[PDB]
From a paper:
More importantly, TubY modulates the interaction between the segrosome and the TubZ filaments; however, it remains unclear how TubY is involved in plasmid segregation. TubY, a putative MerR family protein, is considered to be an integral element of plasmid partitioning in type III par systems. This study shows that B. cereus TubY is a novel membrane-binding transcription factor and segrosome component by binding to the TubR-centromere complex, suggesting that the cell membrane is involved in the process of type III systems.
I determined the crystal structure of BcYCΔ. These four monomers are parallel and related by a pseudo-2-fold axis, and the root-mean-square deviation (rmsd) of Cα atoms (residues 112–174 of chain A and B versus C and D) is 0.37 Å.
Numbering used by the authors:
A (entry chain C): 110 to 176
B (entry chain D): 111 to 174
C (entry chain A), D (entry chain B): 110 to 175
Write the structure that this text describes.
Amino acid sequence: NPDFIEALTEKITEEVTAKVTEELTKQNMEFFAAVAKQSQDNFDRINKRLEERDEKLMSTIRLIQEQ
Amino acid sequence: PDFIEALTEKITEEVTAKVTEELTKQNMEFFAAVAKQSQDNFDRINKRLEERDEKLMSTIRLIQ
Amino acid sequence: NPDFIEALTEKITEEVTAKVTEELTKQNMEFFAAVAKQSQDNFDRINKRLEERDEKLMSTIRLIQE
Amino acid sequence: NPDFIEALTEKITEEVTAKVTEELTKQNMEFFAAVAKQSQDNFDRINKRLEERDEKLMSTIRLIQE
């Protein structure tokens, strides 16, 4: 019967699909989390740069003024 | 053979067609999200640099 | 017998794999190429905007002087 | 022949799954690495620009007004 062929194929297609897409999902999650981490670390580094720069600037403005 | 040929060709097309599709669909959704957090990140930086430069100048002028 | 099963299995396995990877590769090529253009485009914006704020800045430090 | 069909069904599913997962894994590592490096190369890009910006802005104010 082509019913038996259709059926056996779909069983195999489903199992292979399920277990392939499950693994590729887990790998994509891990990559998403790690890129976010990367992004925050990047933002934090930048916001420190701005803090130091704003401070050094205001310090220098202050020294100009006191003259 | 007619059977084994039929089953073999069937399994191959079917697994290939459906795996490609399911990963593709899944990729479109991932590549969309990764591009958004990417642009969100740029929007974040931009807005922060805009604001701090505006505060720098408004400082400078106002103090001098 | 098993050799035959084993042979059908290596054939199916390789036909599928080659087709799937040849697909997820071409896909990853597009996305890579697109995140690069987005990355550079976003760099060009931030740079212009810094130029514009350096000009405003010099204009200001030029007036404070006058 | 149930034993033959069974035998063939098991091996195809194990092997196709094993072979595909492994290739995509391999493709993904190579692929993820290149997103991640392009990403940090872009962040470095911004950083060295802000370092140089802030440094020039600093030098101007001190040279002009101090």
